[PDB]
Amino acid sequence: TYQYNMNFEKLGKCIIINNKNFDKVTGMGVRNGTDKDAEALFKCFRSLGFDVIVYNDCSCAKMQDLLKKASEEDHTNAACFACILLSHGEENVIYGKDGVTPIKDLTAHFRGDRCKTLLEKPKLFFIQACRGTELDDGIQCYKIPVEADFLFAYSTVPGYYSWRSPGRGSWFVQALSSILEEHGKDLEIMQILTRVNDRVARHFESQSDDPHFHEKKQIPCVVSMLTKELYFSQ
Amino acid sequence: TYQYNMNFEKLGKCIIINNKNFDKVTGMGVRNGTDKDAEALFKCFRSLGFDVIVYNDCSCAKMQDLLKKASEEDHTNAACFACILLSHGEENVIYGKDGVTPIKDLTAHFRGDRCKTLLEKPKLFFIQACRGTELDDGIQPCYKIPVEADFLFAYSTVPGYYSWRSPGRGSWFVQALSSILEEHGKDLEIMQILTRVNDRVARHFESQSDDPHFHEKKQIPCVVSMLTKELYFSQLE
């Protein structure tokens, strides 16, 4: 009872949204590497015992639909819920195939008052997406809150670039997959994420022929309203 | 290693800004109960080995200039840095007695490229302040390092929302935080402490009121971590 209870026949559902190809309109490039990230994250979360489903090139509306529908499914026998968004991004919103939807709109479906079978259960959103212009230069009888029990792990701090090598995928995802691969079952969620932060920070530096992009850095950003420790075991 | 190094002469500086009174033109009221909070926290933090300084009723320029100076001091002999803001707030912004300033402008002074002596060390911010008007109704090289690394913010509430404070006991967040650093200040990791605070505030507080719009409300704090190691306030081992 300092831990979330994992005594359920399922760990839970994990939805991957892998947005790669974008409608001409949006003016957004192709995200080479995302398929590599998605595969990695499929195996990872499978290892934990998540029932993982991947949906490719979803528009908004579709994104809302998935998340709304799952919000409405029955989670009684599930320990927790997890969704993963891989897309383009700017502050507070993310890209569909056809436009942008704001994150709060996706997640809100799961608020305690809007999804009872997930009440008092962790809800996890992992989000690899740009968050703005910035780039990093570097240096050497009782109730419970409806907003409680969420955790977001963003690829990056608000207002920043998110790096992704076309041939190896996200820095963040490379990191997060390895760490889960090796420690997913014996580290608390905040430990795992702190290691990702550390690994993305130390061992990664961007290179480009453009000096404006050469030798940039990155740090992921974890937002937590969990109320217990979370382990993916016992 | 996996822990932040704690073998320094001092644990570090701990600045507490205690904004209780405000100029009438800001339309902001006396923050009754805030002195309880500052008291409980200067006790807690001193108790951990912080050198704590308590400022009162600051202007926006004072908050800005204060924190700028702190970041320009020499932290070489210090393991970490902590700052605690107790004021009125709105999304993105905390009040001086003067008016309003961007939380983000306050903390930027400590970015890696502007505060070299705190490079690779945890810079902690704790914030008790309304973050919006929404109410929780409830329910039954060799490599460099990024300049935004090693920050942790612990907001007393989630963005967009209200923060509860008792004229009599002080704010829900600070009661809980302070009470938990008593018991487990020295044996729990920082994210463990703060998770327990989340648990405490969620599970064990509910707003009693006459105006049924402010009646039976709930609260959940919000922790944003950029930390890159585990953090305990002791060398031990």
Name A16's bridge partners: A54, A84
To one decimal, the resolution in angstroms is 2.9
* Per-position DSSP letters for A11-67, written without gaps between them: -EEEEEEE-----GGGT----TTHHHHHHHHHHHHHHHTEEEEEEESPPTTHHHHHH
Chain A residue whose CA is closest to B115:
A139
Place of tokens 């390895």: A178
Q: How far apart are CA B28 and CA B14, in angstroms?
A: 26
Q: Which fold has domain B1-237?
A: Rossmann fold (3.40.50)
* Rounded Cα distance, B219 and B231, in Å: 26
Residues of chain A neighbouring B112 (CB-CB closer than 8 A): 138-139
What's the CA gap between B124 and A213, in Å, rounded? 30
Strands B81-86, B123-128: parallel, antiparallel or unpaired by DSSP? parallel
Choose the closest CB to A144 out of B139, B144, B148. B139
> DSSP readout, A128-175?
E----S--B---------SSTTEEEEESS-TT----EETTTEEHHHHH
Residue A229 near residue A147, CB atoms below 8 Å: no
Structure tokens of A52? 């993982």
The two three-digit tokens of residue B107, written as one number: 């903390």
Torsions phi, psi of B38, nearest 5? -60, -40
- The answer to whether the beta carbons of residues B191 and A228 sit under 8 Å apart is no
Q: In Å, how far are A41, A85, A109, B216 from A106, measured between CA atoms?
A: 20, 10, 6, 27
- How was this one solved? X-ray
What's the N-to-C CA distance of chain B in angstroms?
13
Of B139, B146, B192, the CB nearest to A112: B139
Contact (Cβ atoms closer than 8 angstroms) between residue B148 and residue B123: no
Mutate to test the interface with B, among A140, A163, A229, A231 (most CBs of B within 10 A): A140
CA distance readout (Å), B127 to A6, A27, B93, B163, B218: 32, 39, 11, 10, 18
Q: Which residues contact A41 (CB under 8 A, 6 or more apart)?
A: A16, A84, A126, A173, A176, A177
On whether the CB atoms of residues B235 and B1 are closer than 8 A, the answer is no
Given the residues A58, A88, A109, A115, the one annotated as active site = A88
Sequence ranges of the domains in chain B: 1-237
Q: B142 preceded by cis ω (within 30°)?
A: yes
The CB density around residue B211, as the number of other CB atoms within 10 Å, is 6
What is the least distance, in Å, from the CA of A144 to any CA of chain B? Answer: 5
Q: What chain B residue is nearest to A221 in terms of C-alpha separation? A: B226
Task: Give the whole-angstrom CA distance, residue A214 versus residue B9.
Answer: 38
Query: CB burial class (10 A; 0-12, 13-18, 19+) of residue B59?
Result: middle
Q: How far apart are CA A51 and CA A43, in angstroms?
A: 11
CA distance A22 to chain B (A): 30
Nearest to A212 by CA among A128, A132, A130, A136: A136
CA distance A39 to A43: 6
CATH 3.40.50.620 fits A1-234, yes or no: no
Distance between CA atoms of B150 and B121, rounded to whole angstroms? 6
